[PDB]
Design a protein around this nucleic acid. Structure first.
Ligand SMILES: Cc1cn([C@H]2C[C@H](N=[N+]=[N-])[C@@H](COP(=O)(O)OP(=O)(O)OP(=O)(O)O)O2)c(=O)[nH]c1=O
Ligand SMILES: [Mn+2]
Ligand SMILES: [Mn+2]
Ligand code: NA
Ligand code: NA
Length: 327
DNA sequence: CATTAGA
DNA sequence: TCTAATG
């Protein structure tokens, strides 16, 4: 956690580089397990050989471990960091919609800067264009204070549309968080569950409403169950217009709402930890259900969940407010 | 690990 | 169809 801090960090620096700049899933995969292992190890790695004993660490990495232990730096790491080609990628990759693959390609064609990207908006698909457009606003965090106004709105339309809808803004926002990166709204409806062959409009009508009033200003991707767009709080009585925010809305078969809600409320840790406990307590949890465990090794049969509680009760835990689902 | 765009 | 990119 700090005892092997640099080691794991340099390791991941290295991994990440293989995957993005290079397309070496293997080495890239290599750096990763090593990094995973040395991280666990309970003692201060004092040399490559010591490290070497570890599963995943071989000669290649052991050698890096040394140079780093001796000189508080690393060649390849100095080399890479400097490398403009590789920096370029690490940068373009910041555009929503641009991933490594496209970053490489662009770069090759010589598009390295944001500006290059502008002069060449033509080579960019919708997502990435919108991504390019709001690059600035997309990088900004969401002051909770705004999150509240946003939530406040979405709820009203959702409802105005059909009183039946149930919406819950999940995420860190949910968990108290002072600011969030983007807004996740989980939605479901009684007339939509596990069997009942969809009702795509269900998702569609809200979107349309939301757009109707100008909260959604753009669409990145809309499917029959998961809409991914951009929103904005009405720039009041001018002088202060609000930054463009990322928003995601997803339809859930009402029968698996809370499971989802549980899940997207995180945190990653609260999750696992919740997950591991349900295991002892003879079950299993996942993005959509909780199935009692049978002794034959495994077992199924989706228990009936009516609120976040039921999940709790099932695994027989203490209902933990979202506020404390921090780990 | 699943849902969407795109070509 | 596959393959990229988000989360
Ligand atoms: C990254 C990731 C997230 N999701 C979930 C994990 C999260 N939830 N619980 C949500 C959204 O996570 P995310 O929006 O990335 O982060 P969040 O915890 O809401 O913090 P924020 O930075 O303030 O926005 O989606 C997923 O299904 N698969 C993934 O690989
Ligand atoms: Mn989020
Ligand atoms: Mn999200
Ligand atoms: Na070994
Ligand atoms: Na990106």
């Amino acid at each position: 956690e700090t005892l092997n801090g640099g080691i794991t960090d340099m390791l991941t620096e290295l991994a990440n580089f293989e995957k993005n700049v290079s397309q070496a899933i293997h080495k890239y995969n290599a750096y990763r397990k090593a990094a995973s292992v040395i991280a666990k190890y309970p003692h201060k790695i004092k040399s490559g050989a010591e490290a070497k004993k570890l599963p995943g660490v071989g000669t290649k990495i052991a050698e890096k471990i040394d140079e780093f232990l001796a000189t508080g730096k690393l060649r390849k790491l100095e080399k890479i960091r400097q490398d403009d080609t590789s920096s370029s990628i690490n940068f373009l990759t910041r555009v929503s919609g641009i991933g490594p693959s496209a970053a490489r390609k662009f770069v090759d064609e010589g598009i390295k800067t944001l500006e290059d990207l502008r002069k060449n908006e033509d080579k960019l698909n919708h997502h990435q264009r919108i991504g390019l457009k709001y690059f600035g606003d997309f990088e900004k965090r969401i002051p909770r204070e705004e999150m509240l106004q946003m939530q406040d709105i979405v709820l009203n339309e959702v409802k105005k549309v059909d009183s039946e809808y149930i919406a819950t803004v999940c995420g860190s926002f949910r968990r108290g968080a002072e600011s969030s990166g983007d807004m996740d709204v989980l939605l479901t409806h009684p007339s939509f569950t596990s069997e009942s062959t969809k009702q795509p409009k269900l998702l569609h009508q809200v979107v349309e409403q939301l757009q109707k009033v100008h909260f959604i200003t753009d669409t990145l991707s809309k499917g029959e169950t998961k809409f991914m767009g951009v929103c904005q709080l009405p720039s009041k009585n001018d002088e202060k217009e609000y930054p463009h925010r990322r928003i995601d809305i997803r339809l859930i078969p009402k029968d698996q709402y809370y499971c989802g809600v549980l899940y997207f409320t995180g945190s990653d840790i609260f999750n696992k930890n919740m997950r591991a406990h349900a295991l002892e307590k003879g079950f299993t949890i996942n993005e959509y259900t909780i199935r009692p465990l049978g002794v034959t090794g495994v077992a199924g049969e989706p228990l009936p969940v009516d609120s976040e509680k039921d999940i709790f009760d099932y695994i027989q835990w203490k209902y933990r407010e979202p506020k404390d689902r921090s780990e």
